[PDB]
Amino acid sequence: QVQLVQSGAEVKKPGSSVKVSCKTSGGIFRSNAISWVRQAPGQGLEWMGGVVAIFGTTNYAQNFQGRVTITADESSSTVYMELSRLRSEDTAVYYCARHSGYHITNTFFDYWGQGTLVTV
Amino acid sequence: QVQLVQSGAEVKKPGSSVKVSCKTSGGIFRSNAISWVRQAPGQGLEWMGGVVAIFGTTNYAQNFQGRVTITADESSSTVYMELSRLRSEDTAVYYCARHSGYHITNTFFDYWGQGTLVTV
Amino acid sequence: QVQLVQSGAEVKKPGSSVKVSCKTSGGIFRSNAISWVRQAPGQGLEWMGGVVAIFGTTNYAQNFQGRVTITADESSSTVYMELSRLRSEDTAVYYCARHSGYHITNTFFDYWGQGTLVTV
Amino acid sequence: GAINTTLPFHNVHPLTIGECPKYVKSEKLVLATGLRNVPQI
Amino acid sequence: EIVLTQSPGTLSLSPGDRATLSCRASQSVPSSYLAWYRHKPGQAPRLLIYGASSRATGIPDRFSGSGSGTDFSLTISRVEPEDFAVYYCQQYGSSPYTFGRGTKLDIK
Amino acid sequence: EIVLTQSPGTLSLSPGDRATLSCRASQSVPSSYLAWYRHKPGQAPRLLIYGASSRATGIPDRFSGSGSGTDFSLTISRVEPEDFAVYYCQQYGSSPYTFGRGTKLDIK
Amino acid sequence: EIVLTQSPGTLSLSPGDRATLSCRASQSVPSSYLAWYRHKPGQAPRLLIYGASSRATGIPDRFSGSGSGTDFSLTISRVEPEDFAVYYCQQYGSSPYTFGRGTKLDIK
Amino acid sequence: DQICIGYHANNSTEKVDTICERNVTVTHAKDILEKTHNGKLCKLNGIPPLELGDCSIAGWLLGNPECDRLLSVPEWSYIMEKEN
């Protein structure tokens, strides 16, 4: 019984930023790494980045380096994503996926969020 | 405060078997090895065999190999002795003796059963 | 919140002995070494001896060897000091000091007793 | 009777009046402050 | 960066037909770290198979897969009405964490 | 197979007489593993001495024994009315676990 | 046996004056084991500084000291009405556990 | 030349019980249970108690003729009464 709840749908304009959250339940403190993957309609799923459970180390895909910033607060067990410098073809559905372990490497996505639709 | 209770006296005929039990109290599970010794009237005590406490390994005297089968159940902490192919001079009093340790070797009989008389 | 209570003021005569007690509170058993320091009016403080916390080993200053006997009872967590063969210039104020550790060596006096005045 | 002690437990009588330690039904409560005693070789 | 190619693309069947989905990799996936997900539209994707040979908890026994190297496959012995969705193959043995294209199953 | 031979066999005594029971072994008993049991007729045998030098719990102080090698003995300094039964010597240092002949004590 | 010589002896001051007390040792005190005590007449002495560089618990911040070898000092930046008593220095790095002469502070 | 590591022992016979061992000898032990009472009904904090004796609480309050010694009582720390 583990569920991930995300924010609502958002509408934005090129040049602005987006703040998508993902709260994880099922325990007092987060024990699994959480990653972010997006699906642009007509295109496949793409991996954006993730954050380690307790130590907060973050890894980002080379495509999105310098534009995405994943942060987490240990107090509220929430993971946030900050994609800045919005441009065309940034409209996609963003999911927060929970890894099978505390680290990003060698772990698969146990559970997925329902998803948030962001348009520019 | 440890006591061993056995079955009642039995009468048998040559060619049949005898099924003598020995229930041990004083704890949830048996922790000491239990051995069987018999005394035919006019004859001295003889060692028949024994069973290890938890692992259930059994040892038998060379005189009675192939005719005695000692089995125990861990659930009820009961020890059973089955002597088959009864013949003459098998009339004796059978006692169940509790060893000082979990194993048969290098242990002495702390307590003895009250005894069962079996006639053939 | 640790306090040391001593005996009352005493008057003696040369040739007699003194028995000054020092009971320590704050715990069931004494875990800090207790020493005895005296101050003769017109003179500075002098170290007489001390006793280790649990093992009861006693150390005495070379000036007072053979005249001071420090003993403790583990049951009551009390330390006694017995100065025999009283003579002139033995009038002083005796304090019982609690060391920072269980041993006399390499430890300083955390707390001091209120003090007892003994006249000969 | 009266209780004169500094220990935190007692087993004299459940009904006490005044500043009294805590009553328990145990026969003894001994804590080990030192290590195990092994005889000299 | 390992690119995953899913061959069938579109596979229209009826309940009862054997379903075989093949996922191909340009490079060998280390330790056979590949996973299969079921993504019904409008719902969060669900983990079916992890490690290319192990079933996720709660997954019905009809879902199974096998493979090694650059060749992996997912097999559904019996198709049910709830087995019509898009299936992706993910490799998690490499840093980029690439994803499969996905194959939609249609109703004949 | 070590056979245990008991010499007295029958020993008539009265309360107060010293009782000395001797058990002999055809071979040396390893680690002095020998025990003495008291078996009053109609009752379960009860352990008196274990190890040939150690007194069992609850045994009255009058019961004691000593020995080594092939020679073992049981000594009862003071005889009581309850010390009239058959006494066996058992060795538990060898595999067969043999028993002694047994010695009955009579009333003079 | 280390003899400790306190130089000032008598130091009359007023609230606000800087107070510097010097404690001298015949031979070097090992591991800088030296302590300072405040002994108001009629009261048990209180520990101010231990180790010549560490402040005791509950001690006001104005009390501090430093030193090494045979030279140690106690400094009181601001004098309060309760800072008028006799101050001793002891060494606890040697067996005899000797004490200082003591210095009384007077009111100007 | 040798150096050895060892541990303290003495002539103590104090015994303590552990989670899975009983009567373990230790070098030093402390008993934290009080089992001794003087057996006398003393005064509490210097205030003597109220001793009714053969008289009851109702008898004292009602002014029983046989409880005349209780017609005036001082401050008390606790009340002493009999079972019957």
Place this chain on the structure above:
Amino acid sequence: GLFGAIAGFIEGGWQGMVDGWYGYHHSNDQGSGYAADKESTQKAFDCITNKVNSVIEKMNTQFEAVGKEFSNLERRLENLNKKMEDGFLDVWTYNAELLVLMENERTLDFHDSNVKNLYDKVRMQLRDNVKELGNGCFEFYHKCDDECMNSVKNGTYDYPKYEEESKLNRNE
């Protein structure tokens, strides 16, 4: 013996060790004698002092029994009071008994650990210049005088200084 030091490879205690729980014994040309390890003993004293103090504070707020009187028509009410007071005393008796048993197991095992740590501290410090006899004692391949022994006791052994001398004796 959870850590195998007390009654393990050190099968006997020392009666001459009178100024500390734990320590060393040495024997060379100059002489021999014992020396308690004050630092390890002080750390052990800290746990036991705190362990007992924590015990007192926990049962500081234990249930207290107050006498009450009930009439002959209040049997059910009296039984409630009787079962409440007896039940609370049974709960607190169990907690007090269990805490002592659990702490005794912890204390004895804690003392066992300190010797193993002290034995390993010396072993890792004399890596190759000594022989590990296996009975808690080390035999030096070189000459270790009182100054050398004192360095071993306070953790300042100069392994490179005796490195060359030890290997010449060790080889032959």
Place this chain on the structure above:
Amino acid sequence: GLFGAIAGFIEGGWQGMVDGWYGYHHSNDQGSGYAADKESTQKAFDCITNKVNSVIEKMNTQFEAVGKEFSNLERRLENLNKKMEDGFLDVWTYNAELLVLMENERTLDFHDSNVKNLYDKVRMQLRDNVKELGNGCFEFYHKCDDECMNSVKNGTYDYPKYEEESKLNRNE
């Protein structure tokens, strides 16, 4: 694996150990076979036998529930009785579950300690005449027959006897 013996450097158990918790496996010219360590197993049996007996005695004085009847004008008294019995049952249910959970952790860790001690006892006894393969097995530098093996099992290895022979093969 708090002590690193079970499922640690000893990766798997032995199905051929049928007469004891802990033991040895030897293999030389004469033959090979298993042998259980009766002494260490007996010590483990004593701790577990006492561990369970102590558990039974503590909850022997557990709270007991008695049925009562209250009228419809005694709702407060009925609720008071209901919460007392329910409250005591919750306390004792927590204690029973917690004691089992903690004792299981202690028992498994106690079993892990015995192998590490048994491994170290043999290692400290075969100090230099064997190789430490790292998988719980020692390989001798000399010839160790059945009599030599049995000395290792009962802790009577004669290291000086094979000291000279072992170093000749070890060097070359």
Place this chain on the structure above:
Amino acid sequence: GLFGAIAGFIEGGWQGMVDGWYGYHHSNDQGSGYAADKESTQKAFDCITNKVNSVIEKMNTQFEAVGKEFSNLERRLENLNKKMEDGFLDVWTYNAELLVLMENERTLDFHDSNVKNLYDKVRMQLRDNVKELGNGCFEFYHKCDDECMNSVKNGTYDYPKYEEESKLNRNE
């Protein structure tokens, strides 16, 4: 330090270990850097996750207080109700405080065991081809490049491969 690893022979932590509880540091000709042990860290995360989830479930059925009103003629009933609630809140407060204190001691000691096990795992795999410095570090007697270092980290060291080379440098 019950196992002597944390604040023992490894006297300082690492600020460069940012992606795991435990790990390695290597330094050779190619370069140097840190590397966390993800397997041991994951196992530690499993115990802590279960240990905390155990704490929540046990006190999930804790006693709950309900307010009641009693008249001036029901002092005994009101006092009895008051002592019941106060007694239960004292029992559960003791359990909550004691469980946290006991689990904190276990958690800190559990982490101490992991490093000692991880230190022993490397030591028993590099039996002779390295030199033990005694401060948690091993120094190789041969050349151990990045491929060789990675083998030690994931437990696939090839001792026979470097066996011949190591002894040539070790002897002289």
